[PDB]
Structures are given as structure tokens and as C-alpha cells.
């Protein structure tokens, strides 16, 4: 009765969504046909015959990555009106995905979203899976969050961004894109979750002992986080937390709405033995400066608000045991104007492991969503990568030639300059 739909912009969103929708079809027994041998009406609008089809829109400008889905294992599952393609990709260009190419098929997207809200009596929220690097994921998304805020306004709009790494970069104009796509999503989103690649490569090597992972084996980890925020809308928990509740407990100022996810336990199949994994143990796995999936140091900044999302056979006395030890510790510094810094969620489901996978089978798990000050250092980086390229006017002429002002960048950096000063505004402690 509370339904939530999911959009997939760009190459990054579709390949994440392949790992997502494969995982839900294992939690519920759903075949690739949509058959099954019922609280899952939140994602699966059924048919008069036995078939469940997802509430997903796979939008892209190049038809390349979509043809895997139209020919792969989950061809039969999706609805062939959803899979909107185009002709030319935005091609690492914000000014093509927002002014030129994305303007063409923005109407076919919003018409298809219109036909998915009408099957929903109690429409809950939006999920956008998009990167910051490429042109489609950062330029077509910034158009799309603009349109749904005018169309709806009241509904909760969650993103799951892919934050560009401080050390690994697979693009050259990538700091031009992330400044422009933050100017737009700042006022028309609700809670953008930050995920980095470089921090997952550390987690895939140290905690998992896999030397050679793939985008496949990274996307199995981002699927588990997405399947942990929305596992409270899909099962019968002792303490359920809604997507309308994450917007309140984590956003103290309308500018600052950038948490960073963390999952635990992340262990191999052979190290699944040799340790006991109680909730007094797996809680301390989360607050490490080495298990966060964003390359930042949480000992530099301060946690404004945590949000622990337990699941499995977890008992809420031991949660009180686990949490009370934490804010007695010295290195973890909660913010002084905020005496309460948690939000607990217990669900009655163990995490389900995909066959041919890498994560071990555990009976209890935790996602951790937390809004720390420490991402201000990660925003200090993209202003320094911006000013080393704009001062020499590098790569400007590919953006001017698709409808852009040459002074629009310096206006958009001034947004990021105000956003940089807001974290330091909060991280101080006004006494008396």
C-alpha cells in the first residue's frame, strides 16, 4: 500500500540496477519470468495472471548498456515500455545531457513515470541511481530531479550517487561535471547517499581477500546497502523505519543532506568461521575509519547523526549494550549541540546471499547511514580540482558550444563555496 519507484539514469545506474533487481528476485522467490512458486506490492505491481513486474524505468541516451538487459537473463521480467533508450550518449558532457540530448526524450520519461504513479494508491518515494562522472548520470538527472519536484513536490526523493574518488579517476572533465550537478540537486533532492569506488576497492581487498574484483563485484556491495534501507518497507520488523523517516532524523539543515553509507559484516566465505559476529562486535566494525565506503577520515570530522539499520536475529537489549559503549569512547566525537545521535532499526530478516557471490552467509547484518562533517574535506577537493582547470580555461569550449554561459561555472562554484562554509559553520560549538 506504500509503493516506491526507482529510476536508473546513466550507465552506472543501470549496471547497479542489474545487481539490485537480481537481488530482490532472490529475497521473494520471484522467477526471471515474474512467476513465483504478500507485502511485496511496494515494488511489484502484479498482473491478472501470475506475474510480477518491477516499478523501474531504465533511461539512457546510448542504447549500448540497455541491450544487455533486453537480451540477458532478466529480459522477460521488465516491461518493454520502461526501457527508454535514445540515439547519442551525452558523452562525458553535462551540457549535452541537460541542454541538447536530454531535452529530446525528457517527455517520454515523464510520461512513463506518469503511468507508474497511477497504479500507486499510496506512493511513497523516488530512487535515482546515477553517477557524477558521465554526462547522462549527472546532466540528465539534474533535469529529472527538477521536473519531479515541480510535478510532485511533497514526495521524498532519494538519490544513490556515485561519488568520484580522490585518487582514482576514469574521466578528465569529471570535476567540471560534479560541480554542475551539485548546483542543481542541492535544492530538488532530499537525501543523496554517497558511495565511492576507491573505498570499495579497499573493502574488496582487505576485508574480503579478493585481489581482482570487477564492477560486478563492486555492485554486489551497493545492492546490499540499497536492499537494507528498503527492507523495512518489505518485511515484518520489530522496529521498522520508513523512507519518510530517514528524511527527518538525518537532515538538520536543508543544505546538509549528504550521508555516507557503511555495511557490515563484509567477510569472505572462509573467514565466516573463526569469529562469532555478535551485535556488540559488528557495531564496532561500522565506526572504523577503514570500513566506510567513502574515502574520508571520520576521525577528522564529527558525526552529526548516525542511523543504524540492523537486521536478522538481533535482540534490542544487546543493541542498547552496543550503542551505550560507543558515545563513552573518546575518538568518536558527536556534535556538542546534539545530545542524541542515533536511530535504530531492527528487522526480522537475515541478509540473503546471491549464488555465485562473494559475501558470506551471516545471520545478522547492519547498514550504517551517517551524516558526518568529514565530507567537507571531500568537497574541499573538488573545488581545488575545479580551480586548476578553470583558471587555464581548459575544456571549456566543449561546454560553451551546447548552451552554457562562460560565467555559469564561477556562479556554480560560488554555490559550492557556500556549501563548504556550511559544514565548518556547523562543526564549531557556539557556547552560551
Amino acid at each position: 500500500m506504500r509503493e516506491c519507484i526507482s529510476i536508473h539514469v546513466g550507465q552506472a545506474g543501470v549496471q547497479i540496477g542489474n545487481a539490485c533487481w537480481e537481488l530482490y528476485c532472490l529475497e521473494h522467490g520471484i522467477q526471471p519470468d515474474g512467476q513465483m512458486p504478500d507485502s511485496f506490492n511496494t515494488f511489484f505491481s502484479e498482473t491478472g495472471a501470475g506475474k510480477h513486474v518491477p516499478r523501474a524505468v531504465f533511461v539512457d541516451l546510448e542504447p549500448t548498456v540497455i541491450d544487455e538487459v533486453r537480451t540477458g537473463t532478466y529480459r522477460q521480467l521488465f516491461h518493454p515500455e520502461q526501457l527508454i533508450t535514445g540515439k547519442e550518449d551525452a558523452a562525458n558532457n553535462y551540457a549535452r545531457g541537460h541542454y541538447t540530448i536530454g531535452k529530446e526524450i525528457i517527455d517520454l520519461v515523464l510520461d512513463r513515470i506518469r503511468k507508474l504513479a497511477d497504479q500507486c494508491t499510496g506512493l511513497q518515494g523516488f530512487l535515482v541511481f546515477h553517477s557524477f562522472g558521465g554526462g547522462t548520470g549527472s546532466g540528465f538527472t539534474s533535469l529529472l530531479m527538477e521536473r519531479l519536484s515541480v510535478d510532485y513536490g511533497k514526495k521524498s526523493k532519494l538519490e544513490f550517487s556515485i561519488y568520484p574518488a580522490p585518487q582514482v579517476s576514469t574521466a578528465v572533465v569529471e570535476p567540471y561535471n560534479s560541480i554542475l550537478t551539485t548546483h542543481t540537486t542541492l535544492e530538488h533532492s532530499d537525501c543523496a547517499f554517497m558511495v565511492d569506488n576507491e573505498a570499495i576497492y579497499d573493502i574488496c581487498r582487505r576485508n574480503l581477500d579478493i585481489e581482482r574484483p570487477t564492477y560486478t563485484n563492486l555492485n554486489r556491495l551497493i545492492s546490499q546497502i540499497v536492499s537494507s534501507i528498503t527492507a523495512s518497507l518489505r518485511f515484518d520488523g520489530a522496529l521498522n523505519v520508513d523512507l519518510t523517516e530517514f528524511q527527518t532524523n538525518l537532515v538538520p539543515y536543508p543544505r546538509i543532506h549528504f550521508p555516507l553509507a557503511t555495511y557490515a559484516p563484509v567477510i569472505s566465505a572462509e573467514k565466516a568461521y573463526h569469529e562469532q559476529l555478535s551485535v556488540a562486535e559488528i557495531t564496532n566494525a561500522c565506526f572504523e575509519p577503514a570500513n566506510q565506503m567513502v574515502k574520508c577520515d571520520p576521525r577528522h570530522g564529527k558525526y552529526m547523526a548516525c542511523c543504524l539499520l540492523y537486521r536478522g536475529d538481533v535482540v534490542p537489549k544487546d543493541v542498547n549494550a552496543a550503542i551505550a559503549t560507543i558515545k563513552t569512547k573518546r575518538s568518536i566525537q558527536f556534535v556538542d549541540w546534539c545530545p542524541t545521535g542515533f536511530k535504530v532499526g531492527i528487522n526480522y530478516q537475515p541478509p540473503t546471499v546471491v549464488p555465485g557471490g562473494d559475501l558470506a552467509k551471516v545471520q545478522r547484518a547492519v547498514c550504517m547511514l551517517s551524516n558526518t562533517t568529514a565530507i567537507a574535506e571531500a568537497w574541499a577537493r573538488l573545488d581545488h580540482k575545479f580551480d586548476l582547470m578553470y583558471a587555464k580555461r581548459a575544456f571549456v569550449h566543449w561546454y560553451v558550444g551546447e548552451g552554457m554561459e562562460e560565467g555559469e561555472f564561477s556562479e556554480a562554484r560560488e554555490d559550492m563555496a557556500a556549501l563548504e562554509k556550511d559544514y565548518e559553520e556547523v562543526g564549531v560549538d557556539s557556547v552560551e
Binding site: 580522490p166 585518487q167 574535506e377 574541499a380 577537493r381 581545488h384
Partner: protein, 118 residues
């Protein structure tokens, strides 16, 4: 007879940070002043974690005097203003990471905070 790192720093500037023939006039601007200081230990100040050379120091153990010889930057740094510790692998000819944080004779290069450049 004591321990030094002057043949390592001379090896490191000439092969990893200023190796190309573009920086060959700039390499001679710094290398000729290194032969005159009587410091046993030296250490290299980069800018980012991408290890681009911008400054060179000299280090005095038991006093932690980190006076500046060449480059651009502060005259003296402390243990408060440090981020990472590098070591010049003569094997690989690549600066690796030391997971420790104590500035000793095995440490060959470091990075400072972003606050000291704004």
C-alpha cells in the same frame, strides 16, 4: 661515520619526481644547493597525495628541526600539521605508504593538510 639519506634523496629527485627532460633546468636549480647543507636526514614535501614535488626540507632528529632549504611552503612544520608518511622504495622507484605516523629516518616524504595552502 654516521647514517644519512643524501644518496637516497639524490637518487629520488633525479629519477622519480624530476626525471623528465622538461624539468632538467629546474632539476639543476635544486640539486646544486643540496651538496652544501650538512644535514644527515632530508624529507620531501609534496602537495597532494598524487606526490607532485614542490618543496624540500632538512630534518634534525632529537630536536625535530624541519628547516626549509628549497621550494615553496612554510619554514617549519610540526607533528600537528602532518597527514601521511612516505618511504622511497629503491626497489620500485615509487614512494610507498608507511602506516605509522612517527617522523623517523626511514621516512622520506610527507604531505601536509589542505589548510596550509589556502
Amino acid at each position: 661515520s654516521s647514517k644519512s639519506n643524501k644518496p637516497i634523496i639524490h637518487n629520488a629527485i633525479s629519477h622519480c619526481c624530476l626525471a623528465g627532460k622538461v624539468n632538467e633546468p629546474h632539476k639543476n636549480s635544486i640539486l646544486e644547493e643540496l651538496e652544501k647543507c650538512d644535514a644527515n636526514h632530508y624529507i620531501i614535501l609534496f602537495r597532494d597525495a598524487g606526490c607532485q614535488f614542490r618543496a624540500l626540507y632538512c630534518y634534525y632528529p632529537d630536536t625535530e628541526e624541519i628547516y626549509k632549504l628549497t621550494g615553496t611552503g612554510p619554514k617549519n612544520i610540526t607533528k600537528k600539521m602532518i597527514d601521511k608518511l612516505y618511504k622511497y622504495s629503491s626497489d620500485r622507484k615509487q614512494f610507498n605508504l608507511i602506516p605509522a605516523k612517527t617522523m623517523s629516518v626511514s621516512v622520506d616524504a610527507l604531505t601536509i593538510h589542505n589548510h596550509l595552502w589556502q
